[model samples]
Target: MSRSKVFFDITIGGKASGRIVMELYDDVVPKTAGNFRALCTGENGIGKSGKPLHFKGSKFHRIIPNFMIQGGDFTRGNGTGGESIYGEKFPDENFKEKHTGPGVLSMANAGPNTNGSQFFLCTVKTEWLDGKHVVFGRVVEGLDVVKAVESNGSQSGKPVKDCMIADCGQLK
Candidate 1:
């Protein structure tokens, strides 16, 4: 099992607050997950990492309490897949069929695949979405942070304030 770990020190308005660690199945969605890890966690992020995930101007366009939060819509700026559109609808078969719960890390999508920069932090259990979206990882801790973002709410359902993945990277 090719394992990859990323730690996130999630900050809303500043200050070292909330944190969650994700263990990704890079062997499964290498391209997609890899892109996310590289862009979101590092000293080079435009968000907080040295190399923050420059939204290109994207926002958490959509939010669904107790369900999921959606963002990374290229058309919306923060969207991933800038020039190279992540294949049209990649199936979720490759990923581990895990349940969707708080802190659970899963890829966002339109159809079977369709995962770009968009991902969701589950606020509640959603076993129904097991085989639908790619259940790549889970929130090892700091689910409260996830709830905090959800509670804020945004665009239609998206968070009003910007949610940045302050710092994330492989664990030693």
Candidate 2:
């Protein structure tokens, strides 16, 4: 249990799956990494949007095999909404980390520097996003749970069933 590692206890279709542990790249993207870590722990309380600044009870609103599993829209519970700990959004720290392979955690935004609480875990090599997304972390464990979540996905980025982050926090 490391402080730099955060976990998401996932549940697919209302059944308990497993946890996805992500080791944040604080050394490279401390601002972005810290945002995700704090959100996971919900230590900041409510967001600017009036919703709890937490990943718990939120659904993995978007999913696509060989692509990425996206979620963390705690406010709206869909891919459309989320608020960062800073405000509704924050500046992108940097694009130092590449989407070289799966399990790479990055911010999902409408365009450049629009990072909020929304994030995505890559499921395969995504070199196209190399300089676009801010890669802040990588899955250190429970990638099988990512596969399980991917299995419920469709090419349209929608999961066949609900995929929820039933619980999440920094490792204690």
Candidate 3:
């Protein structure tokens, strides 16, 4: 796959069932994109490995709204997916000027290059991140789903409602 015309259909679960579609900019973050796509697959996915990279409580702990939902820090159980049995953190990147804003698909990392399986979806624009984070794609559809999750959310940031994931290529 050349990583072109890639669309991610995300479904958010709540009073209102909604789906969001997004296009991946493979050319921009080829490595990260490939890693994420691989994680989506059952066999090679972190889930199959008994370590789902993206999921509910087992994967992410916090879920923010308006600005962004963050939950990719190795310090948290939902963040460290690539760590070995001993749980060794990954190295840091050079700190790119990327960002994670509304509709922007980005990897969630604690430090510059500590990104593992942590990722987030932005519901609104954010300037808090100027020269940080790595953006590889954007949400092209289903912004409502983001709102749905935001409406019913937990104080710790965990969505009181579940975010649906259907029409996912791996499951389909």
Candidate 4:
């Protein structure tokens, strides 16, 4: 089976920070993967100012050590906002992917079929969330960077400093 690679560069305090590489499970979760890819390009129609939108400049609004770091809330700097490419919320993909270990990436939602642009990177296993979230991809590189973000966050889950996404896109 073929897989797609997505890359991201994170900046902290206005300086280059980390690189994250993700391998998307297109075959296992095509709808979720496609939505993620569109959001990466700012073509998901979930952008601001009537222009194309991207995850760029978005921060990890919520983080928890040994758990996960959540972000992609481009519409609202906080965790309360996000939209799908379909112009509204989307349904959850079948749970073929599991949240068994670190580097797991899954959608963040309010309830079932509420998937939007928000997602999380698990720094450790979170089996309790197994069927509750949509697992779309896994970190292929820079897992340490993900861990670093977790370490830099506060007890409230906000980054102690600015940890923003500088750029994100599919790697050919």
Best by lDDT: 2
The C-alpha local distance difference test score for the whole of candidate 2 amounts to: 0.89
Query: Clashing residue pairs, candidate 3?
Result: 11-164, 12-164, 13-164, 46-51, 59-78, 63-157, 92-113, 93-113, 103-139
> TM-score for model 4?
0.93
Off by over 4 Å in 2: 1-3
> What lDDT tens digits, residue by residue, belong to model 1 across residues 55-155?
33344456676676655554344444332233334445465657645777777776765655667777778888877777777777677776776876743
lDDT string, candidate 2, 49-149, tens digits: 88899999999899887899999898887778999888887887888889989889999999988999999999999999988889988999999999999
RMSD of each: 5.0, 1.8, 4.7, 1.7
Higher-scoring candidate on lDDT, 2 or 4? 2
- Evaluate residue 9 in candidate 3 and report its C-alpha lDDT on the 0 to 100 scale: 41
* C-alpha lDDT of all candidate models, in order: 0.60, 0.89, 0.53, 0.84
Error of 1 at 23 (Å): 1.2
The pairs that clash in candidate 2 are: none
Q: Could you give candidate 3's per-residue lDDT for residues 1-172 as a string of tens digits?
A: 4553333344445233655565666666666665556545423434324554433233234677456664433234544444322133344333353554577767666676666666677767665765577676676677776666666556567766445444344322
Tell me the number of clashing residue pairs for each predicted model: 25, 0, 9, 1
TM-score of each: 0.69, 0.96, 0.68, 0.93
lDDT (Cα, tens digit) per residue for candidate 4, span 1-172? 5778888898877788789999989999998998888777665543443534578778888987778999988787799887677665889989889998999999999989998789999988999998899999999999988887888877678778888899988888
lDDT of 1 at 26: 77
